[PDB]
Design a protein around this ligand. Structure first.
Ligand SMILES: Nc1nc2c(ncn2[C@@H]2O[C@H](COP(=O)(O)OP(=O)(O)NP(=O)(O)O)[C@@H](O)[C@H]2O)c(=O)[nH]1
Lengths: 180, 258, 123, 465
RNA sequence: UACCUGGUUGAUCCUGCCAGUAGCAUAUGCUUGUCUCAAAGAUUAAGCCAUGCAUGUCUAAGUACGCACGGCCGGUACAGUGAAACUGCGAAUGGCUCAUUAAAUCAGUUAUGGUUCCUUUGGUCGCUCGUACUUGGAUAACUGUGGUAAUUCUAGAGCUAAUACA
RNA sequence: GCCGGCGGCGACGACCCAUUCGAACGUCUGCCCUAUCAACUUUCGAUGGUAGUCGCCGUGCCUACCAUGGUGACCACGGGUGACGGGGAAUCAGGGUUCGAUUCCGGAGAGGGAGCCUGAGAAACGGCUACCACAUCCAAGGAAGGCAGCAGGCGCGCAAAUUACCCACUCCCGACCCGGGGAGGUAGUGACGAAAAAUAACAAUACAGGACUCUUUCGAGGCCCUGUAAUUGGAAUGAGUCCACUUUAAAUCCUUUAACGAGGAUCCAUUGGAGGGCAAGUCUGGUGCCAGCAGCCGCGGUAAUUCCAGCUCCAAUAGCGUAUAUUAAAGUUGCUGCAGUUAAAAAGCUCGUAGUUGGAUCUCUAGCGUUUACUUUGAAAAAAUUAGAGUGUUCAAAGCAGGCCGCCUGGAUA
């Protein structure tokens, strides 16, 4: 006996057919558009979407007056409005089925850092985040797969320490300044 | 196995203590006493986890061994002593008195009482017997055997005992239209009024209880405790008035407060 | 440039303690040592830094904040009595004997094999 | 990589230069490694039991011995036997202390194929009057002359005349001078014969107290086997000879001269190595590079075991655990994967200086005449022995008798060994045999051997095998 | 994601399996920068074990004439810390492993109105009509003489305690 | 202390009743394969009856005397199990199949059997006594054994870590706040497996580069893209080295932060493929049905799209091959849902017991109404797990925390 938990979960599902043109293209488009590292990151978002869709599908089968369906449905919709893949108008359980991978990949910190014009390329954003230049609220995050909340969007600023923002020259600038 | 068990694994402890998984392998293991192991509360949990006074296990025995804590007006230094339903824990150092009442969601809540109310306690009579030259006897849910009871006290009635003495001040009969509380099963901690009982000979008697908010539920006779005469309680209630309000308005209340 | 805040306080008359959650704001420099936290807290609560005990400081990711546990005793006597020995030994009020578990458990199992006053002689 | 290798070689050079320029002189010398050789049943051992005062000598299951071991006598014993006759220098500070190593002597396996792991600082040659000189004694003094080390010669069977007045624990000069004249004349005649028998073999020997000038002269010390007359005179001459001659060579410096001496398979310990720890403060939980049969092995020390003082590596004694240990003793070491190792090679102890290699082709030159000559490629007989020394002895016998050998192993016989003897049976029915010397046969191995067509030759005395 | 694709023929449509495809576990190969979490002598042999350790314990409150310590006060039975030993309790929990075991084990449900129960927590404890202001004997510890190659082996001799034994 | 007696506060005890922790015997319903196991049990207890004995009690538990019963094709009895049983795990449309020695619950045993002392509790093995198998010491008279506790070793095999440090945490035991604990905690070994995530980004140059505007074409640009440039440029930085902390029983790791640290940023990404299945070369050397590749079909016999190599390209990526048990694919075990004229398959034929299935019809007086199956509701049902509410672990797998300037919370629910 030991005081440790063994609650570990797989976050991606591999495709049934390993080599298939039309599919490989579609995944590489997603990588190319949102500068993802490998196809695991696309399968991760497919798996999460699939689980949300399966939850919506298994909720639909219950009657419209059931307390459980009402409570669970509202909670799911609230969370998907909170994360920012829907709006208050389209907040019906039926519309959960009308989402896709694009909607979820748009909410990556990498994507938002590129879309707000902090970085000048989708590839630059991932590096900039990973190099500890970017911060949300007063918290320095270096996770490209940080899924940004709707209300947390309006402040992604450069971390104050950073050379780009804070105002402290790095190794290259220091070395060039000493030999200048 | 051979002889009685002495340990208790952490995950095997009863859920209403809310011990987390990672802190250790073992648990408190309430020692033998008036209340059952499954339905009691160790002082180590009450002090450390609920009142947030002690951090580690040593600080709890450092509190208790200095003899600052009484249970029902009697000093207990045993940190794993079982204090259960209606038991009054008294801290005369800081002048704080608590009665152990179950809350709505079915666990012992940190419900403070005035020092004037920490004088008596209500108790459900388990049996009634007589022996040795006929001095009749009574036995209650917290194992307090009392001699010469009032002959109007029958089985499943409630009695109010002054803690300084060991004598019955007043008693409540178990009849229709009396305020009761559930102490076992799905409906644990719900307060309501008796509507009727359905006697099943050679089996458990089932009672029907109507809540203050028009909610009607059933329960076994063994898991009933009369707390009030008519509708008026003889003790203070927890934060909520024992009203089981559902997840819908739980969310509405939580979001309304925000 | 360090700012000390306290989060959840409590006046624990039962152990003659004032126990609290210490929040340290240090943006530029490294994690502040315990002695500076002690004296700044002692200055904040107008007490001797001798009767202050702090531990469990976990500096947040990014390095703007550090959260830890603090406690101040009513007098050094109650501190000497109630506080565990490991937190005295850091202040230098308690000394540990330089013997290993192997050594004492070895000498125990040797001491078993003789009866009478000769148990003390075997050393 | 190569820059780490370069600085690793240069810091090795720094360390050995520091360990050369350290060089402590002015007394506090090292304990000499006293070697003892003989013929067959002369009395090379049991004299050691008489020195250390051990009751168990005959417990060998035979008159002959088949291993190397160091008795480890320490000063209290030297002082105790010294105070008996009391010659010179009461409580001498200048004495390191004695370390005697026993060697097995025999015609077959040519006196342990020796190669006596050299390191014979003071070699004791039993001459044993009764029988005169012997062919193993002449080949042993040839070996002692091959690598020039100082050695002395002791007589054993002087009391075995029938007429010797057995006055134990007294002076040889006195005890000889207290006999009749005709016996002294017989002893001086056979002494003259021995002196001439050494003189002809490129030596200059004499009777241990004339001149002496041990620079060129060699000391004929008369000793009694059973009674123990001369044992005092022995240890006196040993400490005198080591004090006079080995004044500079036996310095307590800080190089790393640990030598792999014996390999043993002990129950519940794995495969243990007996090492004569001469120079180098090697630590428990510190890496060593043991020179192996199939390349070198990186070994992590689990701990240091030593037998009690005045006790041999003969019978399983209560081996005391020691965490660390100074450089003057013979100790048993155990770790992980000490399966295939070579005997009579130096042992390198390594700290964390990122793996210090390549010292093996510089050792393995013309000492290749060992176990390495294994023909797994071809057919052969299977061989097992208690210790490695015995395994070499069996293989060089098979080499002399012209029989190929396929597999070799150390420790007791198992069902895999009889299965290797079985997988041979298909090729050549005669060759499918196991030669097991002084090892425990297992029931499962024996019953599997009897169920198949595989014979096992079990014997404690090598003559029988 | 309720999925199929190659292979009998000169070609066709089938039955039909072999092969491919993905997941999960044990092994193993080659490769291996950072960080968190984390299984691990089960399968074959519930086969066999050197060595070290894993169950001990004293409060103001059962027994203190060990100077092992110094301390009063010196006519104060016993100032105190306290080794040792007698006494009390624990060692039947914990840990390990899966040989056994097929209405057996075990799971859900009921019964003891057919039984025991250290401990805790209450009740009870001059309800009995017949030297007491404290009764008796020993044995450890300690001292002293020993035996055996040998073990946590123990015999004989001289004192002395009780919440031990009466 | 009160006027020689009378007393308050505890601690050890104590016959017995109640209680708590249990334990032990039972009640009903539920288990894998086997008919090349069809009748079994009852001499020596099998099923029941009366009386006792024994036991903590109920009872063929055992003895005495009687009765001749008890179970069984609704599968008894016997044999097998690479069988400890559950909570659960993998896979998965719906149905299912397979695994569950292994951290929680219950059972069992300390090499194999048997017998017992002490105690409330043991048929105890880190208690004893004997035998059986192994084996240690020995002065040969006798003595002492039990790792399927933690390390470690041997063996076995395809298959598995350190003779480490500490009672600080979680708890347990004792006369006990004070002692002890290989329970347990913390390191070491660790590509069993799971989560996050490096191996570069931007700017400036030329393209017999691309698109957008002008000219019918040639040929014209700070509108937007581009690489197989070892072309040009400073900006950013973690890997390592190493102060100081913080963390911790003491350390380590992480987080924090001085100093150093990027131009083949030589601070170098591998493992498998490139005929089809199946994504990728009829490119060039070599070999010549030899060597080898190839899960399957097939490729090799002098122009090899498949072998051994070079170059190039594809796949997944700090991972990817290979073998083997198992699941989906398998509507190729078919209840949902398969076949049986010829592809494998309906007994040669009829009777017949068990088995399964079976035609219309009938609109309440504290006890009942003819009793079930069916269906809906209620109480009872251990956590962990699974689904799932809440909560920025810096995100996530997780965790059960946390949030506001002493406070307001949560630890749901199915
Ligand atoms: N009196 C006497 N006894 C002797 C003499 N040599 C041997 N012995 C005795 O003979 C017996 C056997 O001799 P041993 O010492 O074993 O001979 P070894 O040459 O040492 N044998 P090993 O080959 O084992 O080393 C012993 O009891 C030993 O004391 C001798 O010269 N004189």
């Amino acid at each position: 006996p030991v005081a440790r938990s063994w609650v570990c979960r797989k976050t991606y599902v591999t495709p049934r057919r390993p080599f298939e043109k039309s599919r490989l293209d579609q995944e590489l488009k997603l990588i190319g558009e949102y500068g993802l590292r490998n196809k695991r990151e696309v399968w991760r978002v497919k798996f999460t979407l699939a689980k949300i869709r399966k939850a919506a599908r298994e909720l639909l089968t219950l009657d419209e007056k059931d307390p459980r369906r009402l409570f669970e449905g509202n909670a799911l919709l609230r969370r998907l409005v909170r994360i920012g893949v829907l709006d208050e108008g389209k907040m019906k359980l039926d519309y959960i089925l009308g989402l896709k991978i694009e909607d979820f990949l748009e909410r990556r910190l990498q994507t938002q850092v590129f879309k707000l014009g902090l970085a000048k390329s989708i590839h630059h954003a991932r590096v900039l985040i990973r190099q500890r230049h970017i911060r949300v609220r007063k918290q320095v995050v270096n996770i490209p797969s940080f899924i940004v909340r709707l209300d947390s969007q309006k402040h992604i600023d450069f971390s104050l320490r950073s050379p780009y923002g804070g105002g402290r020259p790095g190794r290259v600038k220091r070395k060039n300044a000493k030999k200048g | 196995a051979r002889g009685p068990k002495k340990h208790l694994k952490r995950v095997a402890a009863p859920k209403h203590w809310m011990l987390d998984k990672l802190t250790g392998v073992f648990a408190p293991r309430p020692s033998t006493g008036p209340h059952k192991l499954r339905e009691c509360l160790p002082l180590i949990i009450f002090l450390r986890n609920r009142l947030k006074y002690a951090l580690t296990g040593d600080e709890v025995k450092k509190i208790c061994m200095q003899r600052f804590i009484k249970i029902d007006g009697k000093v207990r230094t045993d940190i794993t002593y079982p204090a259960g339903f209606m038991d009054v824990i008294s801290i005369d150092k800081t002048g704080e008195n608590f009665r152990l009442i179950y809350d709505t969601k079915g666990r012992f809540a940190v419900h403070r009482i005035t020092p004037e109310e920490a004088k008596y306690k209500l108790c459900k009579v388990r049996k009634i017997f007589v022996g040795t030259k006929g001095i009749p006897h009574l036995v209650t849910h917290d194992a307090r055997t009392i001699r010469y009871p009032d002959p109007l006290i029958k089985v499943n009635d409630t009695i109010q005992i002054d803690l300084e003495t060991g004598k019955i001040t007043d008693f409540i009969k178990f009849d229709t239209g009396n305020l009761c509380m559930v102490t076992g099963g799905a409906n644990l901690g719900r307060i309501g009024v008796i509507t009727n009982r359905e006697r099943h000979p050679g089996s458990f008697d089932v009672v029907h209880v109507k809540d203050a908010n028009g909610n009607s539920f059933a329960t076994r006779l063994s898991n009933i405790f009369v707390i009030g005469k008519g509708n008026k309680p003889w003790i203070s209630l927890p934060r909520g008035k024992g009203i089981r309000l559902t997840i819908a308005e739980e969310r509405d209340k939580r979001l309304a407060a925000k | 440039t360090v700012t000390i805040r306290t989060r959840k306080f409590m006046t624990n008359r039962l152990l003659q303690r004032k126990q609290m959650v210490i929040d340290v704001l240090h943006p530029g420099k490294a994690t502040v040592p315990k002695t500076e936290i002690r004296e700044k807290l002692a200055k904040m609560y107008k007490t001797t830094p001798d009767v202050i005990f702090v531990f469990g400081f976990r500096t947040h990711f990014g390095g703007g904040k550090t959260t830890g546990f603090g406690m101040i005793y009513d007098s050094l006597d109650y501190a000497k009595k109630n506080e565990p020995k490991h937190r005295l030994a850091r202040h230098g009020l308690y000394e540990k004997k330089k013997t290993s578990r192997k050594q004492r458990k070895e000498r125990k199992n040797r001491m078993k094999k003789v009866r009478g006053t000769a148990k003390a002689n075997v050393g | 990589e190569e820059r780490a290798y370069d600085k690793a070689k240069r810091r090795i050079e720094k360390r050995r230069l520091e360990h050369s320029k350290n060089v402590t002189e002015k007394d506090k010398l090292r304990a000499p490694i006293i070697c003892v050789l003989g013929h067959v049943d002369t009395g090379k051992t049991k004299i050691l039991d008489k020195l250390r005062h051990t009751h168990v000598q005959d417990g060998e299951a035979g008159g002959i011995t088949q291993q190397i071991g160091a008795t480890n006598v320490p000063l209290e014993a030297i002082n105790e036997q010294t105070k008996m006759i009391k010659n010179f220098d009461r409580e001498n500070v200048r004495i390191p202390g004695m370390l005697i190593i026993d060697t097995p002597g025999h015609e077959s396996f040519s006196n342990l194929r020796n190669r006596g792991s050299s390191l014979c600082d003071i070699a004791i040659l039993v001459v044993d009057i009764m029988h005169g000189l012997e062919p193993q004694t002449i080949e042993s003094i040839n070996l002692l002359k091959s690598k020039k080390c100082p050695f002395i010669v002791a007589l054993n069977k002087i009391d075995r005349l029938y007429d010797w007045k057995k006055s134990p624990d007294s002076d040889v000069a006195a005890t000889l001078k207290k006999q009749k004249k005709n016996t002294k004349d017989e002893f001086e005649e056979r002494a003259k014969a021995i002196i001439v028998e050494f003189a002809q073999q490129g030596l200059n020997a004499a009777l241990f107290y004339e001149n002496k000038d041990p620079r060129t002269f060699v000391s004929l010390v008369p000793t009694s086997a059973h009674t123990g007359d001369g044992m005092g005179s022995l240890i006196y001459l040993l400490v005198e000879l080591t004090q006079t001659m080995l004044s500079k060579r036996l310095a307590h410096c800080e190089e790393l001269r640990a030598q792999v001496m014996e390999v043993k398979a002990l129950p519940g310990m794995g495969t243990t190595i007996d090492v004569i720890l001469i120079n180098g403060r090697l630590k428990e939980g510190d890496t060593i590079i043991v020179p192996g049969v199939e390349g070198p092995i990186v070994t992590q020390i689990r701990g240091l075991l030593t037998p009690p003082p005045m006790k041999e590596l003969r019978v399983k004694n209560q081996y005391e655990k020691h965490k660390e240990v100074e450089a003057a003793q013979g100790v048993k070491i155990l770790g992980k994967d000490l399966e295939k190792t070579l005997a009579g090679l130096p042992l390198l102890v390594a700290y964390k200086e990122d793996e210090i290699p390549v010292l093996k082709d510089e050792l393995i030159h013309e000492l290749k005449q060992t176990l390495n000559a294994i023909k797994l490629e071809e057919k052969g007989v299977y061989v097992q022995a208690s210790t490695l020394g015995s395994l070499e002895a069996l293989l060089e016998f098979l080499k002399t008798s012209e029989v190929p050998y396929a597999g070799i192993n150390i420790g007791p016989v198992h069902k895999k060994d009889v299965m290797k003897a079985s997988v041979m049976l298909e090729h050549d029915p005669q060759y499918a045999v196991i030669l097991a010397f002084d090892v425990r046969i297992e029931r499962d191995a024996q019953e599997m051997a009897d169920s198949l067509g595989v014979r096992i030759f079990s014997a404690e005395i090598i003559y029988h095998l």
